[PDB]
């Protein structure tokens, strides 16, 4: 992930019997999460700033359908980014507390390498997929 | 006429509990908000006659 490239971070070198919560690791993950939260907040701000120029400048009737179409996508998108920030913040509370890293349905533990991939993961691969199946079935 | 919970509120209340001038200002701003987001200028004057 270009995520590790933007920062001067190199893939984490997990040692054989390496634990999970030391001074250095939580200080390390706190910075990443804070930096990650701060970037999204700047992204949400830039989005709102771009949307207002369109709302302030009035397009010509002919290009209204194209401007309106593009304005709606940003808005939908903007609201999506705001949800993600709240999700990371929720994940930032899981690090500080003591209930991070396990599937919420069954006590099974979620993988270490899996959590580095999606730190917002709430379920293990088995439980998450069945939920998507019921979803397609309970919906459609 | 204070907010005892949140969420949108019905205009029937605003007129009843808070006043003829309160609800009229509620409509004009909340409709103009939609038009003014789209760059359309409609003087409140018109929206007022409808109210």
């Amino acid at each position: 992930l270009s995520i590790l490239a933007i920062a001067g971070v190199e893939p984490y070198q997990e040692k054989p019997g390496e634990e999970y919560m030391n001074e250095a690791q939580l200080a390390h993950f706190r910075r990443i999460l804070e930096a990650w939260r701060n970037q999204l907040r700047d992204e949400v701000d830039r989005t709102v700033t771009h949307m207002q120029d369109e709302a302030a400048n009035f397009p010509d009737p002919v290009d209204r359908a194209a401007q309106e179409e593009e304005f709606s996508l940003e808005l939908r998108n903007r609201d999506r980014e705001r949800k993600l920030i709240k999700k990371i913040e929720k994940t930032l509370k899981k690090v500080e507390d003591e209930d991070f890293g396990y599937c919420e349905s069954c006590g099974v533990e979620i993988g270490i390498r899996r959590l580095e991939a999606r730190p917002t993961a709430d379920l293990c691969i088995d439980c998450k997929t069945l939920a998507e199946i019921r979803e397609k079935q309970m919906a459609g | 006429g204070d907010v005892i919970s949140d969420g949108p509120e019905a205009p029937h209340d605003i007129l009843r509990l808070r006043g003829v001038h309160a609800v009229t200002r509620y409509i004009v701003n909340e409709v103009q908000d939609v038009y003014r987001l789209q760059g359309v200028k409609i003087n409140d004057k018109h929206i007022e006659v409808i109210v």
């Binding site: 009737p61 209204r64 309106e68 709606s72 808005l75 | 939609v34 038009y35 789209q38 760059g39 359309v40 409609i42 003087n43 004057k45 018109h46 929206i47 006659v49 409808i50």
Partner: peptide, 30 residues
């Protein structure tokens, strides 16, 4: 630019003014 004249039928022209731009608003929810 002068003040509104006696007899002008402002009810209609009010209505008209609001309803013309209805084409420029989005019909979803946004």
């Amino acid at each position: 630019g002068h003040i509104i004249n006696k007899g002008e039928a402002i009810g209609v022209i009010a209505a008209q003014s609001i309803g013309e731009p209805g084409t420029q608003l989005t019909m979803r929810t946004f």
